[PDB]
Amino acid sequence: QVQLVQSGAEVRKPGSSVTISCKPVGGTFTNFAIHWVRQAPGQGLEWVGGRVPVVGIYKYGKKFHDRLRLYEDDPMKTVFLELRSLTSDDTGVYYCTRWRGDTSSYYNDASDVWGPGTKVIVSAASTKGPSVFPLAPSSKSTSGGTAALGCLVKDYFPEPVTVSWNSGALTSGVHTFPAVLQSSGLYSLSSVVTVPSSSLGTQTYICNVNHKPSNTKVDKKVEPKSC
Amino acid sequence: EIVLTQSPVTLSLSSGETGTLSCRASQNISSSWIAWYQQRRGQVPRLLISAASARAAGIPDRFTGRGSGTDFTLTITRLEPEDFGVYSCQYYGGSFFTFGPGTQVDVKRTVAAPSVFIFPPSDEQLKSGTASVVCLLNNFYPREAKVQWKVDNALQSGNSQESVTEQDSKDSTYSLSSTLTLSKADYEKHKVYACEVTHQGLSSPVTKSFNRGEC
Numbered sequence: 241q242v243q244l245v246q247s248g249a250e251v252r253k254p255g256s257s258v259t260i261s262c263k264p265v266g267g268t269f270t271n272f273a274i275h276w277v278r279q280a281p282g283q284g285l286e287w288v289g290g291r292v293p294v295v296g297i298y299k300y301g302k303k304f305h306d307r308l309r310l311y312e313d314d315p316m317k318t319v320f321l322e323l324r325s326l327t328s329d330d331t332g333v334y335y336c337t338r339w340r341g342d343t344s345s346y347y348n349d350a351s352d353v354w355g356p357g358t359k360v361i362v363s364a365a366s367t368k369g370p371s372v373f374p375l376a377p378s379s380k381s382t383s384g385g386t387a388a389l390g391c392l393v394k395d396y397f398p399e400p401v402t403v404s405w406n407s408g409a410l411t412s413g414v415h416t417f418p419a420v421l422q423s424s425g426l427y428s429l430s431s432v433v434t435v436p437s438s439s440l441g442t443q444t445y446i447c448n449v450n451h452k453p454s455n456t457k458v459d460k461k462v463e464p465k466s467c
Numbered sequence: 468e469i470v471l472t473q474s475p476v477t478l479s480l481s482s483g484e485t486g487t488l489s490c491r492a493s494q495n496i497s498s499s500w501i502a503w504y505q506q507r508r509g510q511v512p513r514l515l516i517s518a519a520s521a522r523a524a525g526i527p528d529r530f531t532g533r534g535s536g537t538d539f540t541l542t543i544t545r546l547e548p549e550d551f552g553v554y555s556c557q558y559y560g561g562s563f564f565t566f567g568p569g570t571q572v573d574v575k576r577t578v579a580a581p582s583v584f585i586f587p588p589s590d591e592q593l594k595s596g597t598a599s600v601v602c603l604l605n606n607f608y609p610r611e612a613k614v615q616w617k618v619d620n621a622l623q624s625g626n627s628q629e630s631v632t633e634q635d636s637k638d639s640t641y642s643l644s645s646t647l648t649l650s651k652a653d654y655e656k657h658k659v660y661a662c663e664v665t666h667q668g669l670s671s672p673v674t675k676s677f678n679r680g681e682c
């Protein structure tokens with residue numbers, strides 16, 4: 241009946257290091273290896289490294305052989321992961337994992353106990369409100385009575401941002417895409433909607449953007465454009 | 468190094484249907500070191516099977532793992548709506564562990580070609596020194612979609628990002644955005660901006676384009 245608790249999410253500058261703690265609650269400490277698994281945004285699971293506490297049996301992933309460091313503090317029964325020289329490839333969620341089931345040490349096991357995960361964001365950005373640009377409807381976004389339009393919510397940090405249409409009255413046909421961390425370290429997303437093309441001259445379309453961390457709120461009206 | 472590959476990328480199934488996921492190892496390995504994990508919409512991975520075929524505690528009967536040598540499979544016989552997600556195989560033998568790239572099981576649906584829309588950058592953004600060109604693929608199925616940007620018939624590589632919505636709860640379709648980021652100076656040096664979309668629902672690739680300045 242073991243449970244793993246991990247330290248909270250962090251934003252880290254490129255070139256710096258990140259340390260993530262993991263404490264097993266309700267179990268032993270020097271029997272089973274703690275295997276770390278991370279997950280880059282949208283990418284597959286990736287084993288980082290594993291270490292049997294105190295016993296010293298450990299192995300780092302080949303890609304992290306020179307940047308990774310696994311240790312623990314025995315009096316606090318807490319293991320630690322340190323990853324140095326962070327780049328954008330190291331952004332993701334980091335999971336602390338373990339197998340459950342006199343005394344010995346076992347390293348080669350699947351992981352049925354998973355920590356909640358620690359989100360790591362590698363970015364040099366500070367808290368910043370977004371700029372809201374129109375995705376203007378045109379002939380290049382109309383097709384047989386259906387017009388597509390939207391709003392580009394670009395260059396904010398951190399997540400999240402909320403987007404609604406016409407103060408919530410417009411919900412059908414709305415697609416607000418997941419945010420993406422740009423090469424600058426600032427997030428960006430688009431929210432789109434499809435409407436009857438005949439409504440462009442009669443109906444107003446406003447995207448309501450709210451970035452709570454920066455206290456930034458923008459109501460942007462999307463107007464047609466000759467394209 | 469032992470590397471694991473998985474097939475297919477996206478396996479489409481309906482409620483009550485049976486499907487098999489494949490995990491191939493680069494070398495011959497002992498079946499005692501293969502595990503399968505399940506990842507749902509928003510939670511941590513969950514161990515389903517270890518030692519290739521030993522089902523984990525509390526894992527329902529629908530999941531059965533088989534295989535030896537290099538070919539290892541995970542079968543879902545009568546899946547329920549809670550089984551839709553991403554499944555990854557793992558090799559935990561030796562000193563270095565590894566995971567497969569993962570396989571997404573999504574709700575099966577009839578083929579639906581994407582509606583393709585393109586948006587120029589706004590004049591407001593151009594003042595800031597940057598330009599974003601957005602290509603929208605709306606309500607398509609299946610998931611596999613190829614989007615290529617062409618700027619004056621020059622293929623763009625490395626200056627576009629794409630984001631996809633989760634499968635819709637109503638019509639089980641996907642929507643995809645592809646955003647091409649260029650500087651202000653580079654954007655004004657060229658005229659024709661096109662996104663070319665390849666998809667099973669399309670008999671031929673669709674090209675949506677515009678001419679800068681005229682747009």
Ligand SMILES: *[C@@H]1O[C@H](CO)[C@@H](O)[C@H](O)[C@H]1NC(C)=O
Nearest residue numbers: 492493494495496535536537
């Ligand atoms: C695994 O063993 C089988 C049986 O000898 C052989 O046919 C196959 O080529 C081997 N593959 C690898 C990657 O060793």
